[PDB]
Amino acid sequence: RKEELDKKLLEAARAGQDDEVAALLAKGADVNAHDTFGFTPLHLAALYGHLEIVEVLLKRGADINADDSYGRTPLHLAAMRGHLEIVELLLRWGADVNAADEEGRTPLHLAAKRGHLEIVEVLLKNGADVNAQDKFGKTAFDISIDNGNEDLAEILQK
C-alpha cells in the first residue's frame, strides 16, 4: 500500500504532472523513494526537464546529493541533458559540484563530453576543479583535445 503509492509518485514526476505530484505528496508519499537502480523523484524530474516539480520536491525534503547505483547525483543527470535552468536551481540549494561516480567523473566531465558549453560556464563559475582526474586518468582538457572542441578548449584554458 505504502510502496504502491511511491511507485505512483515516481511516474508522476517523470511524466511531468504538477497536480499529481502535489496530491501524492500531501498523501504521505516518500520523496526519498527509489526504483531498482536508485532513481529518486528528484533524479527523474531533473532528467526530463521539469522545473516546478524539482522546486516542490526540494522544499518537501528530497535529498539533493542522493546517488543511484552508479553514483550519479541529480546534478549529473541535469548536466548531461543540457538543462541550464535546473542546474542553477540545484546549485542554489547547495548541491555538490565536485561529486564523482563509480568511474570518478565530475559533472564538468559529463557536460564537456556531450558538448553543452553554457552548462560548462556555470559549473566553472561555482568552483569546479578543472584539474580533476577520473579513475582512468583523464581531464576535462583532455576531452576537448580528443573530441576536437576548440570552443571548449578556449573556455577550459581561460
Binding site: R14, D35, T36, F37, F39, L44, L47, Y48, S69, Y70, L77, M80, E103, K113, R114, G115, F136, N147
Partner: protein
Amino acid sequence: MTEYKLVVVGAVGVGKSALTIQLIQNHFVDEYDPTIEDSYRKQVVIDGETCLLDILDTAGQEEYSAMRDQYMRTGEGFLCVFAINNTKSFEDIHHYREQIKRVKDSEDVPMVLVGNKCDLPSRTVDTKQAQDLARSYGIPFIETSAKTRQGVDDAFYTLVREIRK
C-alpha cells in the same frame, strides 16, 4: 594499451541497458529509464591481454546528439541487439545497419548480431531466421539473456575478437 569504442544499437525495449550493466556491474537491472544515454568504461582481459572498453548505450534516437554522432563515426564495433519476442525490432535491424553503413562509409564493419531475452519461452523469432540474416551479412550471431547472464560475456568478447581480425 588498446581502447575499443563499442556501440550498442537497436530498437527500444530490446535490452540494451540491461546488457551493458550486466557486463559491468554483474547485476540485472529490472527497470531502467528508456531515455538515458551514457558511456561506460571497463577493464577486461581477452585471451590473455588486458584492454579498455569504451561502450556507448544509445537511447533517445529521435533527437540529434553530438556525442552519439561522434561515437557512430569513430565506432570500431557495433552490437545490433534485438528481442526474440518482437518481430518489429528484428525488422529494424536492417534500418540501423544501413545507417551505420552510410555513416561509416564502408562495406565491412566489425559487427555482432545479438538476440536478447533468451529466457522468455514465448519466442517469436526462430534461430534459423536470425542465423540466415547473420550469414547474409557475414557477421557472427549470438543469443543472450540479461536476466540469467546467459552469453553476456561471450557477446562483448566476440566483438573485440572481431575487431582484431
